[PDB]
Amino acid sequence: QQMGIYAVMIEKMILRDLCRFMFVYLVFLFGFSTAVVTLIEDGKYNSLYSTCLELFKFTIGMGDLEFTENYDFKAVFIILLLAYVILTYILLLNMLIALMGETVNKIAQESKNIWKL
Amino acid sequence: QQMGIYAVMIEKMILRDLCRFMFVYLVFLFGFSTAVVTLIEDGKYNSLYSTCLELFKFTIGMGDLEFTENYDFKAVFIILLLAYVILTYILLLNMLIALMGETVNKIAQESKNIWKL
Amino acid sequence: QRAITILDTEKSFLKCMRKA
Amino acid sequence: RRNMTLVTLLVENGADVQAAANGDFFKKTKGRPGFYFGELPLSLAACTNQLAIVKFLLQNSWQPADISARDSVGNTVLHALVEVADNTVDNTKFVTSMYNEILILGAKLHPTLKLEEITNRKGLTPLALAASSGKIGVLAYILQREIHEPECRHLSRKFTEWAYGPVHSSLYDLSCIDTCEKNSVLEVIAYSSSETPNRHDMLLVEPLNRLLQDKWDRFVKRIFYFNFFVYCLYMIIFTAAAYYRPVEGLPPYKLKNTVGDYFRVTGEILSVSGGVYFFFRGIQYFLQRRPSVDSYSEILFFVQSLFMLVSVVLYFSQRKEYVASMVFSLAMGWTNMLYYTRGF
Amino acid sequence: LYDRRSIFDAVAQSNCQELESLLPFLQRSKKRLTDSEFKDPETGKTCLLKAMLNLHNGQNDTIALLLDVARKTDSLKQFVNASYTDSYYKGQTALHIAIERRNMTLVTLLVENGADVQAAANGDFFKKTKGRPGFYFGELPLSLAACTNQLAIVKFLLQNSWQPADISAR
């Protein structure tokens, strides 16, 4: 009746928030990651897996910013990536958190008598 | 009247939020920390105290992502560890803030006359 | 928005036998 | 000034009653004002909630008032009451009755005049005028209604067939989903420039939830998910080509060797071909609503396709840059998957 | 002479006059009114359930006089108890309707003349909504009666004489 609540909230953000979210996230990752591997030629930043991860960090917050001196064709890698970073760290997650603090509002309190069950 | 709010807030968040939270946190850190020591062989990455601190980096958001080459079996470290980072920085703490800001809501106003007291 | 995807996908499907 | 008597004197005394008032004070407000009850005195009378004197003008003798004189904007009286409902519970209350009233009376005098057909100059039926203006309560009404009466059914819209003890059934008409000819209500609330916040709620219950729930069950959910997975394989094949493009600078130029070569240059044409598709679908959208962000999702398909196309032309100018374009289009397409949820 | 259509019209407009010479007609040809012929053959519906879809003000005196003919051929008990045999109103008898039409009186008469009161209605209409609808009170004319919140007829159907309704009929 003080900890049993926190058990639930992790179980319910994991059921609701993730599935409703993990698909609107694998399209913004899979499509930019694909966009990067075509655009850039090398680095463990072409292997599609190694890029979907390297693009995942930014969205965690672990972003290595501009890592790579390698491209023909001048600026367009940095716009493509900033476009993803303003779009993906600064703009999706605040929606994902804002939905979670949206659970944490209501599943904190009238959730309660669910422990008794 | 105006400063004696910031001293009750820090005070109530440390007693309530931390106690309800520092247990449901030490059971994700202790658990994955004990897992990465079993899986991993070395680096001041195997001493558990050094792990449980390193993994603690991630939550506080000083994460280095992939800081090491030494592991047999390739990725079953990175997915275990992403499984923690999506699970612990991106899921738990928003719950922990969302608790706190759920208090910065209420202990702002009907708190007031407790400065009278 | 289901309805906008509807009101069109028949308008762009040759105006055919449906309840009408 | 709302006076049954002097009104009665002037009309016993030969007032002319088809007399328009069309100063800018009556058309929409400069702001001059204002306001618009649509000109014609009977429209003025019914619209001023004077049930008695809209009855007087029509039952009277010296000149019963003509009922179908469309005013200067072509709004008939029924067109005028609908321009004046404001979705207040009591405003709906009296206009929905005053309108109920003119039609029960047009049935009495001149049963031949199908009067909810009379279009304004802009072609709308009075319903299509309510619904294109988010007048949710007259629209709840013209669609919901059935007067029970003699000569009622010529009046009525939606007849009730069997009431079992807990329930009702109904049979609705409908003019609207099947006024594909001119301005369907759904075509009108489905554009839905929705710049009146009054629009969205009003795709709700009376004749139209249960029906667009029912199109979607029957044929057009089924067509949608075919129309969906065709885009997905368009997206995989367009990845697949972009992802196995060459390095050899100046591309292609030409390609023949063996099999993967064959399979890919198929994927490069299959992609631009769906690019010109959307560019083409999108001009036709831009042209059917030539002109109108009402439709954000209408846009970014076009913007992608124009990136399929300023790629394709650059692949032929032999600029080495064409990829930069095609990489955006590819980032766009996978993002344009997002809309095709609407609504899970 | 008379045919189905001749009473099913005649009841529809509450004409007890187009059924006067009906009493001496169904003495001659020995034709009756529960017959397949005088029920609409498909809605299990009889010059009584046609009186019951065509209640006017919840009353009629073709019901008094018809049922009084149907007593005179002793078509009566089946005459008052055919129920819809189409899937839709299925196994719904005139007592189901009179209860669904809230009417202590045609109720107390039909169960005097011996309506059946365990006439099951079991279409997909009564079980759960396909959507058909619907709805589910659970079939039996008493569960209908209590389920339609009518505390007096439920008292009647159980505390009456001709057949008190059994209470445990699942």
Author numbering:
A (entry chain D), B (entry chain C): 560 to 603, 627 to 699
C (entry chain B): 700 to 719
D (entry chain B): 211 to 502, 508 to 559
E (entry chain D): 111 to 280
Question: Which of the paper's sentences describe this entry?
Answer:
Here we present a model refinement protocol that automatically generates series of molecular models from CryoEM datasets, which describe the dynamics of the macromolecular system and have near-perfect geometry scores. Here, we present a computational method, similarly based on the GMM-DNN architecture, that builds a series of molecular models from a CryoEM dataset with structural variability. Each model in the ensemble would satisfy protein geometry constraints and fit to the reconstruction of particles from the same conformation at the target resolution. In addition to the FSC, we also introduce stereochemical constraints of proteins and RNAs to the loss function during DNN training, which ensures that the model at every frame along the trajectory has valid geometry.
